[PDB]
Design a protein around this nucleic acid. Structure first.
Ligand SMILES: Nc1nc2c(ncn2[C@@H]2O[C@H](COP(=O)(O)OP(=O)(O)NP(=O)(O)O)[C@@H](O)[C@H]2O)c(=O)[nH]1
Ligand SMILES: [Mg+2]
Ligand SMILES: [Mg+2]
Ligand SMILES: [Mg+2]
Length: 405
RNA sequence: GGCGCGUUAACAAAGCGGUUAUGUAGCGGAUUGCAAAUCCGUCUAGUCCGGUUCGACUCCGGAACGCGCCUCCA
């Protein structure tokens, strides 16, 4: 008769991002294990429990995001483990759309790779405010001077995308060794093992660097949909991180974006990690039960909002920076008619570029402003950041400056 | 969420890194006494957006839509 989520401690959303195989998943399992040893609430999550799909089992990689909860002495967490493969960045963006802070995982053996800087840029344009790096796989590095070099380059990479690279906490360690340790003896506490302690160093960094975001509960409700489930006996459920406002049961909301209609529905449920919540407020990784709505009347990319608060749009001008050749972007310029993919929070959508009279071409590494017309409407705001991806690579990072309509 | 499959002109159906495959009706037009048979003409050719190239329907990327199969239970 179920289990309510009591706000004993402040809740913050986190996740793991970084190049493929750098360790994101192992560290996630490691986090739940060490945190559990101290806090008995944390349900342990093993590597197999993270990458559970058969494609992930055989192919040996994280293809879609995984949601895991744990907590320290100070705050509760909702951890979203992201894919590092270049082919599945589409899903990496969706995870970053729910992070109040992100853990940048960088293998000491390889250093900052293509998806390292790619996730920095992307996470930024999807809302991720602060970052906590974690030099993983130190157990494979002999020369200490090399680890210094790794740390230095990761700081430069953060400062390249306007993050506070010099102030960002860089915790060296080894997720594999810490996880292994937690298996042999799960009673292990702080100060008992050096590898386990390096993970506690991490939890402490998260606790002290990533602040508990200012909650905008005074603004109109807005809940970017991240996932849609079909729960037997209950109905259709939407999940995501509340951006602003609050939501108690019996509240009416609109499903805006990716559809001509602006469907209405009443909420018959609200839960934070399988736990019923009184009323989910901003920063909550909820799960709302939508009345009358079917398994396909709502989808990721849309947005649950206060009825009337948002009116979906398609046209808009924005200030954009086209990535350079050596940033994983284009090597050739483009013109009007170019139809790339645009990313606004949990939304991916094709749009057409309309260059202004006076400009004919746009070269890589140029900061330019232009109009865009999406093939579908979506919750847009002046100031909202976004991404432009095409051909498997990110090509531009922009900011909405005026909604044409 | 993932993987696969389908997209050439009004429709049908090919080959090919470059100098015109091709068929078939709907319409138009010569023509017929009027038709018919037969020719002349017609119609978004490579769904769309990028890359390689002197050159792309053809090669490599992406996207849209459609359809299947797993995954997807706060
Ligand atoms: N030597 C060593 N190996 C490690 C460490 N952490 C993880 N590994 C190993 O490195 C490999 C990749 O780890 P991973 O699966 O990524 O935890 P990923 O970044 O989640 N992968 P993906 O990007 O595909 O989602 C695995 O073989 C894992 O066991 C570490 O600290 N040291
Ligand atoms: Mg992983
Ligand atoms: Mg089939
Ligand atoms: Mg459930």
């Amino acid at each position: 008769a179920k289990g309510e989520f009591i706000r004993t401690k402040p809740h913050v959303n986190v996740g793991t991002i970084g190049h493929v195989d750098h360790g994101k998943t192992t560290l996630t399992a490691a986090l739940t294990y060490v945190a559990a040893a101290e806090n008995p609430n944390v349900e342990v999550k093993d590597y197999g429990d993270i990458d559970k799909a058969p494609e992930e089992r055989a192919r040996g990689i994280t293809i879609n995001t995984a949601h895991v909860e744990y907590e320290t002495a100070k705050r509760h967490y909702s951890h979203v483990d992201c894919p590092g493969h270049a082919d599945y960045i589409k899903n990496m963006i969706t995870g970053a759309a729910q992070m109040d802070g992100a853990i940048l995982v960088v293998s000491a053996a390889d250093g900052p790779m293509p998806q390292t800087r790619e996730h920095i840029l992307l996470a930024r344009q999807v809302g991720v405010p602060y970052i906590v790096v974690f030099m993983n796989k130190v157990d494979m590095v002999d020369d200490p001077e090399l680890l210094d070099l790794v740390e230095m380059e990761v700081r430069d990479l953060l400062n390249q995308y306007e993050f506070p690279g010099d102030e960002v906490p860089v915790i060296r360690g080894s997720a594999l060794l810490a996880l292994e340790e937690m298996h042999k003896n799960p009673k292990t506490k702080r100060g008992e093992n050096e590898w386990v302690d390096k993970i506690w160093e991490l939890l402490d960094a998260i606790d002290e660097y990533i602040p508990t975001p200012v909650r905008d509960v005074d603004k109109p409700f807005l809940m970017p949909v991240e996932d849609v489930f079909t729960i037997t006996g209950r109905g259709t459920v939407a999940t995501g991180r509340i951006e602003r406002g609050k939501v108690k049961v019996g509240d009416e909301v609109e499903i805006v974006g990716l559809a001509p209609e602006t469907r209405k529905t009443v909420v018959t449920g609200v839960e934070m990690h399988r736990k019923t919540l009184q009323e989910g407020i901003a920063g909550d990784n909820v799960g709302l039960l939508l009345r009358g709505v079917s398994r396909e009347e709502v989808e990721r990319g849309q947005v649950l909002a206060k009825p009337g608060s948002i009116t979906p749009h398609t046209k808009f001008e924005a200030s954009v920076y086209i990535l350079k050749k050596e940033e994983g972007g284009r090597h050739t310029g483009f013109f009007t008619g170019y139809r790339p993919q645009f990313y606004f929070r949990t939304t991916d959508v094709t749009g057409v570029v309309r260059l202004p009279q006076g400009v004919e071409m746009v070269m890589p590494g140029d900061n330019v402003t232009f109009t865009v017309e999406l093939i579908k409407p979506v919750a847009l705001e002046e100031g909202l950041r976004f991404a432009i991806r095409e051909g498997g690579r990110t090509v531009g990072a922009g900011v909405v400056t005026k909604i044409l309509e």
